Design a protein around this nucleic acid. Structure first.
Ligand SMILES: [Mg+2]
Ligand SMILES: [Mg+2]
Ligand SMILES: [Mg+2]
Ligand SMILES: [Mg+2]
Ligand SMILES: [Mg+2]
Ligand SMILES: [Mg+2]
Ligand SMILES: [Mg+2]
Ligand SMILES: [Mg+2]
Ligand SMILES: [Mg+2]
Ligand SMILES: [Mg+2]
Ligand SMILES: [Mg+2]
Ligand SMILES: [Mg+2]
Ligand SMILES: [Mg+2]
Ligand SMILES: [Mg+2]
Ligand SMILES: [Mg+2]
Ligand SMILES: [Mg+2]
Ligand SMILES: [Mg+2]
Ligand SMILES: [Mg+2]
Ligand SMILES: [Mg+2]
Ligand SMILES: [Mg+2]
Ligand SMILES: [Mg+2]
Ligand SMILES: [Mg+2]
Ligand SMILES: [Mg+2]
Ligand SMILES: [Mg+2]
Ligand SMILES: [Mg+2]
Length: 92
RNA sequence: UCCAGUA
RNA sequence: GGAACACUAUACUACUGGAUAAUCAAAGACAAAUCUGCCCGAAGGGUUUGAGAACAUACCCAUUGCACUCCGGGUAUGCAGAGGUGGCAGCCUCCGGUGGGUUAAAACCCAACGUUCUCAACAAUAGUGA
């Protein structure tokens, strides 16, 4: 079910955290307000990202018209976050 | 190994 | 440069070039100034070396992983950041290589950024200066 935050994996793992962060914000902003965007390069969390929209509809729109996008030479695999983000839970 | 310049 | 005040000389360390006549030369940050706030100490001042750790950058092996506290293994690299007397924050200035503005081109201006911690060793000798 639809959720403010989207989960993206299959990201290029050779890309630095700073770079990936601005590059994600640049292609997703055109869909709505973005509270924050979580990115780690751990063993467990690499290749993936979380993008938090302020509106649930923005998430949905982004998921749909961006799925499979060639992001850094690698199709994106956007899906909904299985759980709500901290920023959102401690907000509403 | 020595010598100078520089720091 | 020469390491707990300052300068000089010596030892000594790094870069560059040279062979006793040792060329000529390149190169190069502690220059100016001594800031504001809070905090800690009995005392605020390291251009040394090393060992750990973390961090960053390259590749290599693994990894398709649903998180919101950093955090897989490995080889190689780091030897540029500086001054403002401890720490954190900020501000001022310098040095550096980037990105903009300005120019005919430079200046000049703007901005962001630059390896940290812990431990151990060393911080000499001569002269001079309070
Ligand atoms: Mg100097
Ligand atoms: Mg000297
Ligand atoms: Mg001296
Ligand atoms: Mg020495
Ligand atoms: Mg000259
Ligand atoms: Mg000087
Ligand atoms: Mg001096
Ligand atoms: Mg001075
Ligand atoms: Mg005091
Ligand atoms: Mg006191
Ligand atoms: Mg003293
Ligand atoms: Mg000093
Ligand atoms: Mg799982
Ligand atoms: Mg590693
Ligand atoms: Mg290493
Ligand atoms: Mg050395
Ligand atoms: Mg460096
Ligand atoms: Mg102070
Ligand atoms: Mg400071
Ligand atoms: Mg500059
Ligand atoms: Mg220009
Ligand atoms: Mg012009
Ligand atoms: Mg120019
Ligand atoms: Mg700085
Ligand atoms: Mg001494």
């Amino acid at each position: 079910r639809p959720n403010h935050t989207i989960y993206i994996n299959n990201l290029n793992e050779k890309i630095k955290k700073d770079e990936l962060k601005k590059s994600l914000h640049a292609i997703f902003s055109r869909f709505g307000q973005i509270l924050d965007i979580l990115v780690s390069r751990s063993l467990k969390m690499r290749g993936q990202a979380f993008v938090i929209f302020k509106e649930v509809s923005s998430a949905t729109n982004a998921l749909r018209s961006m799925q499979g996008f060639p992001f850094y030479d690698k199709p994106m695999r956007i899906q909904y976050a299985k759980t709500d983000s901290d920023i959102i839970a401690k907000m509403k």
